[PDB]
Assembly symmetry: C3
Homo-oligomer: 273 residues x 3
């Protein structure tokens, strides 16, 4: 009945500690807080401050200069509530300190994400087709969103998703996840990042990892979130019969398929039941 | 102007009776009640009782044991309102009498579905590419849903869909379908199953069969439905120009395509206009 | 800061006038009114009158005769609010003067659309793979919609979309587009058609053209719109790295891809952020 969202130290997992507790969490819950992963509250504030300054004080001209011509929220600025997005390349940076700060922040996120994904693979004895490092050298997307003073349940289609929130001034907890058949609060932890396992973790490990559903509840209620999707390459290859065995309703002829075969030609980050 | 949802006896259709009335119904309405198809109210109650018992009385542990790690509603239990899903293989059965009861129920549904699909093909002089039996040896999905005391209009992308409902205690009729340009009640019939023709019937027969839109209206209002989708294999092959002729807005290069080419790498069961 | 939706004369653009103003509009706004393109208010009324007469006075039998068996809104009549759709072939025409009127109207729309698309390509120095004329000999869809006395923001996935509205009797302006970070009215112009650049303009020109988001606001509030999507052929081919550079979140292996590879096997006309 234990419906508590656990916390693991990345460093401790890397030492081979708590493997049973970790495997069990992955199987039964698919989400956890992660400490000791190089992701500090002080840095979150560094990056958050300068993007919030851009959101509030950037001109329409400065904003347009870092807005994509198609409004995909893949790179640069998106007005909706506002978002800033980046990946490993093709970024759009406002002038000044922004690029140095956000490149470093992105890098630390990407490293942490690969590192925890590596532990998810290790804990489940999983060797992706083509090898672990090729699998993790992938197609990440970071999105930073400001929400002024709400979201339908879905599960993520990432390998893993890392989430760093800033809290509502009034102390309301917006993010919730299904745990043990009940929606459970997922509050800000100045000391920890939240990790959701995505459908790709389920797929790659042959069903050893749960992709939990989550949502944001409606109620000083403004908040921001940094969401880092670790997304596989288009050519990530998996077994078709094995996908069917763990609940994927695939329409795929023959025995192996790629991520592109399954999802199509545009990334899809989330899915509803 | 006759906007009445008709009923046909499967046995009678199999005898070659009412071919005109049947062809006309398929063309102009795309839905009908089906009697004499091996699907009894007593069996519906047998299967419904033991899954309702599981929904109400199963522990979170028992539920988790038959819940997929991705919440696709393909197999086993899904909490949302609750659902139980199954196909021809890879099933997740609660302990005891459940598996025997639900395997038999699934089988009778699958047989009825193939049998009526065979009559839809016969009535329209349709020989699917690769032959009738290969076409019908396919990828069915049964979903049983409990609705506590609502759904946007869509059409189904199945060949056919068979629906067995249990009624609201208060006698409200929830399911409705467009018939003759008007939404028409589709009440429980203890003696009959409701059949919707899906877009695949339209596609395979070269437009001889309508895929009607339907929805569920809001008002003792609780209800359950058993929905059996007869879905084609990924390699079902059809003519591209012929698909375009009957209203399919296909983006497909060249002259033939497969169901996977059209729909993509995950089954999609329903579509909105 | 100039958030005004501009107007260009097609004839003048064809003369090579206003190239700077046109390039800038395409880059920063992605939409404009178009005059002198062979599309008269008198013709809009000719075609609108006879389809409105059909909507109001056509029998269910006449309507069924020009309704597709799948409710895709690709061709013929769709009851929802009502729609009439057509393309270059496979049309469904009510009896009488309708076909002559609507074929001529469609043709004038298609010509105007190709002509302005040709200018978008010229202004941006773009040579589509396979050449300009092959690219423009494509898969257009015209939809004419009556709205009785509302739509979420999206951008179009067309090359260009041409829109001819009829106004609300009461003078309410329903259609709005993001311009300079603000939603801007897009009123009826008896003398001009509205052109939205779509995501395919963005893609083909390597990011030189914006695909603006737009929506319809809620308030004599009835209105109609004629919407002509100029949509590429399934085999339209583009550079994968170049698509990524302009914000497309593609999951495509290797270096080139087709429109079908990206979008899948059914046209998708619109997308949300
Ligand atoms: O997929 C994205 C999310 O679940 C966003 C969650 C959040 O708002 O914190
Ligand atoms: O596609 C599924 C349905 O139309 C479900 C209908 C129902 O609720 O009975
Ligand atoms: O994509 C279609 C539209 O944006 C329709 C706009 C309109 O209602 O005028
Ligand atoms: Fe999520
Ligand atoms: Fe349905
Ligand atoms: Fe649009």
């Amino acid at each position: 009945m234990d419906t508590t969202v656990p916390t693991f130290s990345l460093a401790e997992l890397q030492q081979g500690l708590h493997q049973d507790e970790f495997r069990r969490c992955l199987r039964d819950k698919g989400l956890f807080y992660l400490t000791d992963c190089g992701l500090t509250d002080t840095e979150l504030k560094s990056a958050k401050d300068l993007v919030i300054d851009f959101f509030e004080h950037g001109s329409e001209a400065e904003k347009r200069a870092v807005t994509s011509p198609v409004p995909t929220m893949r790179r640069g600025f998106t007005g909706l509530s506002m978002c800033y997005s980046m990946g490993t390349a093709d970024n759009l940076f406002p002038s000044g300190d922004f690029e140095r700060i956000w490149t470093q922040y992105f890098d630390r996120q990407y490293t942490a994400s690969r590192a925890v994904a590596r532990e998810v693979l290790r804990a489940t004895g999983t060797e992706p087709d083509g090898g672990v490092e090729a699998f993790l050298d992938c197609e990440p997307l970071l999105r930073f969103r400001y929400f002024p003073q709400r979201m339908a349940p879905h599960y993520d289609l990432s390998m893993v998703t890392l989430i760093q929130q800033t809290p509502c001034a009034n102390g309301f907890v917006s993010l919730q996840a299904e745990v043990g058949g009940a929606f459970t609060d997922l509050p800000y932890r100045p000391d920890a990042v939240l990790v959701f396992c995505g459908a790709i973790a389920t797929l790659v490990t042959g069903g050893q990892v749960k992709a939990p559903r989550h949502h944001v509840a409606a109620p000083g209620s403004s908040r921001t979130s940094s969401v880092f999707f670790l997304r596989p390459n288009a050519d990530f290859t998996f077994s078709v019969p094995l996908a069917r065995e763990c609940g994927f309703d695939v329409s795929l002829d023959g025995e192996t398929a790629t991520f592109q075969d399954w999802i199509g030609g545009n990334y899809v980050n989330i899915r509803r039941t």
